[PDB]
């Protein structure tokens, strides 16, 4: 059996998956995650996969830091690296969801004239995080630590304007009867790295 290596976390809007190396050859893996409180909990048992979805555990407390470990076990009609005793494992880097999960790509839900403005509404994407029993939207999780930044321009001139909101609503001025294009981006101002999502697809009304 070959101990697992390159344990990395893949996380977007809290959906979290631990990945690792190598594709198994005559071995299976069992993954454990611990709320840094020590007490480990196996989540993926004797699998040939090289990834394990741990969303169920991290979303119990996104601000808490998490530790994971992958155990290697002999598989199939074979010997046993040792005496069928202490399997080869490996711990993962630490992971604090709130601070490290990537911000998913936003989606503009609609455009509507309101008074002399155009109301651009961002879809409040629900996540797997749950408080009391309700699935929390990304806004619920971050509160005001999340800003949506809008970019908009007339397709003819390409002159760009930008606006920000810490709700999911924008109220902006646009020249009447002109075709505009819009793109929205998510940002967590308090972060110093990985603070920006990729831009929503350009929508030219």
């Amino acid at each position: 059996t070959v101990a697992a290596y390159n344990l990395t976390w893949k996380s977007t809007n809290f959906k979290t998956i631990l990945e690792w190396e190598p594709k198994p050859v005559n071995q299976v893996y069992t993954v454990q995650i611990s709320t840094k409180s020590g007490d480990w909990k196996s989540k993926c048992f004797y699998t040939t996969d090289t990834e394990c979805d741990l969303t169920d555990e991290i979303v119990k407390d996104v601000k808490q830091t998490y530790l994971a470990r992958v155990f290697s076990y002999p598989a199939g009609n074979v010997e046993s690296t040792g005496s069928a005793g202490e399997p080869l494992y490996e711990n993962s880097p630490e992971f604090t969801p709130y601070l490290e999960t990537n911000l998913g790509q936003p989606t503009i839900q609609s455009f509507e004239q309101v008074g002399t403005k155009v109301n651009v509404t961002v879809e409040d994407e629900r996540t797997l995080v749950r408080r009391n029993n309700t699935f929390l939207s990304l806004r619920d999780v971050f509160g005001k630590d999340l800003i949506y930044t809008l970019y908009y321009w007339k397709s003819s001139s390409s002159g760009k304007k930008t606006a920000k909101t810490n709700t999911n609503e924008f109220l902006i001025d646009v020249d009447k009867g002109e075709n505009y294009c819009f793109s929205v981006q998510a940002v967590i101002p308090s972060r110093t790295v990985n603070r920006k999502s990729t831009d929503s697809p350009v929508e030219c009304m």
């Epitope: 920000k164 990985n194 831009d199």
Partner: antibody, heavy 117, light 108 residues
């Protein structure tokens, strides 16, 4: 540690162009919005425009649109402001500033651009 | 476009005083109002953002207040290093606009 270092002072003749830069370090400029602010001798601060290096979008104040171009080079962590058809009113100190979303949290020390014949 | 009217353009104070500087926006800017301090020949420095949030390491002598169109920057227990020029900035939507500035000078 976050720092913004502006290129040196420059003298330019009326009608020509000038391109100043700002070297960022201690962070990735594609994670922020980089802006340029000018201050004429004895006057206040005035927003010129800025750029989002993650997508290339540049925004310019209507008064400068047409003769200012703001670009970024992510491989060298440098942002630039090029201003053309230079005139006297353009003589000023230009500051590079980082927009974190809620604030222009970091500023360069400013570059003096003198436009004179 | 949003206009910012900052006042007063100049104010006189003594060490220990409490002074208030105001910025009124031409429309509701939803607290995307920040304040900066600038001393002669120095670059501006962030004091307060999102109307009332004190920036990292900035003295508690600085506080901000407001929502809608009206905002204030108050400096309490005014200290010698506080005499300088102050600017508000609306940057919730471009074009971004600075107030005209307020120079806080020494009374005698």
């Amino acid at each position: 540690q976050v720092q913004l270092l502006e290129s040196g002072a420059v003298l330019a003749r009326p009608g020509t162009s000038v391109k100043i830069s700002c070297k960022a370090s201690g962070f990735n400029i594609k994670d922020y919005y980089m802006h340029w602010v000018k201050q004429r001798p004895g006057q206040g601060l005035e927003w010129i425009g800025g750029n989002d290096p993650a997508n290339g979008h540049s925004m310019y104040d209507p008064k400068f649109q047409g003769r200012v171009t703001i670009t970024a080079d992510t491989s060298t962590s440098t942002v630039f402001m090029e201003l053309s058809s230079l005139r006297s009113e353009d003589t000023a100190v230009y500051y590079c500033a980082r927009d974190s979303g809620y604030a222009m949290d970091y500023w360069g020390q400013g570059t003096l651009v003198t436009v004179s014949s | 476009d949003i206009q910012m009217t900052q006042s007063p353009s100049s104010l006189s104070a003594s060490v220990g005083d409490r002074v208030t500087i105001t910025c009124k926006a031409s429309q509701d800017i939803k607290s995307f109002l920040s304040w900066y301090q600038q001393k002669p020949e120095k670059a501006p420095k962030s004091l307060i953002y999102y109307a009332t949030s004190l920036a990292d390491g900035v003295p508690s002598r600085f506080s901000g207040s407001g929502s809608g169109t009206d905002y204030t920057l108050t400096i309490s227990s005014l200290q010698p290093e506080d005499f300088a020029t102050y600017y508000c900035l609306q940057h919730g939507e471009s074009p971004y606009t600075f107030g005209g500035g307020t120079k806080v000078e020494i009374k005698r």
